Design a protein around this ligand. Structure first.
Ligand SMILES: NC(=O)[C@H]1CCCN(C(=O)Cc2cccc3c2OCCO3)C1
Ligand SMILES: [Zn+2]
Length: 139
């Protein structure tokens, strides 16, 4: 679990969105596993606007942060789950690191701010849904 709170927006994994997220929907994209909902309170986070390929992510299944080298956002095949059929997930970044299903929502940050959230993993890999291209989050 986990979310990004920036301005009057809450960014979560689309497959973990609540009834309240859907009732306050701003934008969602099944191909990216992302959903953004509106909030009444002002958020705590800053979004990175950069091309960093190194950062640190929070891994809830270890209660620890780990440093990672990650690939540029791209289209990657993701096997069928209870949430989605087998498909290509877009804007996805891979890195070597521990992750388990319940780790989705953990934040990946670089020195410039929030880069994205854990969305996939397995076999010593961790995949992150990028948010740096969503310029409208800052207005
Ligand atoms: N973006 C998607 O389509 C997700 C939706 C939720 C399920 N899924 C995963 O990859 C879950 C997962 C995360 C992290 C480590 C995992 C793991 O699955 C087992 C092995 O280790 C695909
Ligand atoms: Zn950066």
């Amino acid at each position: 679990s986990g979310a990004i709170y920036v301005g009057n927006y809450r960014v979560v994994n689309r497959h973990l969105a609540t009834h309240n997220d859907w009732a306050n929907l701003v934008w969602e994209d099944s191909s990216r596993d992302l959903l953004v909902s509106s909030t009444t309170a002002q958020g705590c986070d800053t979004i990175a606007r950069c091309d960093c390929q190194t950062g640190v992510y929070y891994c809830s299944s270890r209660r620890k942060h780990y440093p990672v080298s990650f690939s540029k956002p791209s289209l990657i095949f993701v096997e069928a789950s209870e949430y989605y059929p087998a498909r290509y997930q877009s804007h996805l970044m891979l890195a070597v690191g521990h992750s388990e299903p319940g780790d989705c929502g953990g934040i990946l940050r670089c020195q410039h701010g929030v880069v994205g959230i854990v969305s996939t993993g397995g076999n010593g890999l961790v995949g992150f849904a990028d948010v740096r291209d969503l310029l409208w989050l800052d207005e």
